[PDB]
Amino acid sequence: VLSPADKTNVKAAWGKVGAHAGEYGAEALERMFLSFPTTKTYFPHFDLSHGSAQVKGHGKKVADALTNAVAHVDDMPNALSALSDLHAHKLRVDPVNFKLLSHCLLVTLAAHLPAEFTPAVHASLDKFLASVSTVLTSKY
Amino acid sequence: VLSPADKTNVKAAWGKVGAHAGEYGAEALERMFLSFPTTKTYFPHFDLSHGSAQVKGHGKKVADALTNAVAHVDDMPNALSALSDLHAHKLRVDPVNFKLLSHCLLVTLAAHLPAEFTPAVHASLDKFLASVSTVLTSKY
Amino acid sequence: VHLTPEEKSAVTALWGKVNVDEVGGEALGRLLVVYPWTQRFFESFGDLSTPDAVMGNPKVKAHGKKMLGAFSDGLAHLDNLKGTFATLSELHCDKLHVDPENFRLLGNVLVCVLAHHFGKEFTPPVQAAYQKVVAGVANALAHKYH
Amino acid sequence: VHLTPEEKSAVTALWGKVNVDEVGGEALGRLLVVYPWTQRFFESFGDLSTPDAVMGNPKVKAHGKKMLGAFSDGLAHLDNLKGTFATLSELHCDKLHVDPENFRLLGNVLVCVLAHHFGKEFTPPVQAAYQKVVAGVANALAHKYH
Numbered sequence A, B: 001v002l003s004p005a006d007k008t009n010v011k012a013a014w015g016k017v018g019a020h021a022g023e024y025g026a027e028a029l030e031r032m033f034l035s036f037p038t039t040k041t042y043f044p045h046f047d048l049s050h051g052s053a054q055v056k057g058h059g060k061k062v063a064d065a066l067t068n069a070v071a072h073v074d075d076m077p078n079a080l081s082a083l084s085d086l087h088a089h090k091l092r093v094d095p096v097n098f099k100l101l102s103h104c105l106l107v108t109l110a111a112h113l114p115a116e117f118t119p120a121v122h123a124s125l126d127k128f129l130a131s132v133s134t135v136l137t138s139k140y
Numbered sequence C, D: 001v002h003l004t005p006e007e008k009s010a011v012t013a014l015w016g017k018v019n020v021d022e023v024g025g026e027a028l029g030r031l032l033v034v035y036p037w038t039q040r041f042f043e044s045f046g047d048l049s050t051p052d053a054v055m056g057n058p059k060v061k062a063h064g065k066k067m068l069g070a071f072s073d074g075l076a077h078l079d080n081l082k083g084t085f086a087t088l089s090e091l092h093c094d095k096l097h098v099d100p101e102n103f104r105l106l107g108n109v110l111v112c113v114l115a116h117h118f119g120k121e122f123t124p125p126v127q128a129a130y131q132k133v134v135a136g137v138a139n140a141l142a143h144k145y146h
Ligand code: HEM
Pocket: A039, A042, A043, A061, A062, A063, A065, A066, A083, A086, A087, A091, A093, A097, A098, A101, A102, A132, A133, A136
């Protein structure tokens, strides 16, 4: 459950992401694949090397979905509807893996937003990513 | 997110619990304390021995709150409002511990409801207990 | 790390009554029903569309007996499960890439199945003993992830 | 289990730049802010009402330096963290009853703090190396729970 403060913090921090949205998504994915190799088995048809055009393209999609979630933070289940179905039915993504990607997104944000990544904003982003993860795992 | 089928399954299984509601709550607690000793530190003022009047009394409270949740399954956050505040603010219960108690409640239900505890109902009860746990940890 | 004699007693006494062939199919089946993402590792098993389909699936009971076989084997070697589960650890970790959290869930499902089957006989101390066992098996299987 | 030479290289090179005194207060502080139930173990520390209060709390930085001290110590002994963290394992497990999941969260917070501090220098392979470290420390601390 996001507080008014959380939503403010999330909108502000992600607003500072700007044209890097795609790029940061791709980096979070690479961080996940390298730190948590079990996740790689979901992308057997991706080249997961550094600089992979496929990871870059996919990171932009992941970032865009996060942006949709920020833009509609009061009704994320509705907004992420098709994605919930995809990850649970079609892909059958293990819920543990959402925690891994969420952590790597925080690390990426931390690494790129020195000023914005305060303890308060960190807490807000963590809860936001957990709520997103809840929605994406909600149709099992 | 509980499906129509989940709510039916949960209402039916818990409906079969009847006058044992209190008793089963107490047993789930005892199962938790014995299987997961770290949980005991939340009740330093309870005697946690088998047959403890305090555990029995508390199990009835836990069972009653579950019943409230079943009775208002479409708006659990509202229904469990005061309890969410208690467990997060006052008691600061570690979210891991809700998974432990939830498991021990399933075990108790399994041990007492041979007929009702089908695979489908098991799945439904697990999701129900997870949603309850989500609400009770929602005010951190 | 070590079961007490009373815990060992609880485990072995109960397991002597377990229908190895049946309890295995049941736990695996319930894992697949209760935690549906776990089906992703068994695409070959055919029909897993509904709970009845999953439980009644020949491939699921067959493999569940295999799984529990390894478990039944694991109980006769409770001293060092690490060495005992090594072949299975590499398999599950290096080749299947099962997240170790699933080992924990399976053990808890098994506990639910035992409770279902034994009812009042599956007492809280008996359960506590089996929780140490299923955690040990889970950790042994996860060792190759470390 | 074992860091590769390149991972060891990543860990030690970065840690030589870490302000041990400061990074400790920061990680503990962020743990208490981000995962508020963890405050339950530090009732003695006084004011923890707001994020600024928590981060600015003298008792939190003092103990965070202690904590990270044990961590900084843990890096000079990466071969057997189990024996290395034994005193702390009994303390945290037998006496404080901290759930081991919290060891995992703290390690991940530490990773976030390192990322914050080092920015681009905290690359994905550098992170991957530290994830193996924080997981090792977490597991070593949890050993007495098994
Ligand atoms: C914040 C959490 C997540 C978000 C926002 C997200 C977002 C997305 C989006 C937007 C797509 C559609 C891509 C497209 O239509 O081209 C997608 C697909 C996919 N996702 Fe995720 N995802 C998340 C978590 C995960 C995790 C944890 C995994 C596995 C470790 C995963 C695995 C996949 C896979 C395998 C696809 C299909 C890719 C393909 O076949 O091209 N997702 N995700």
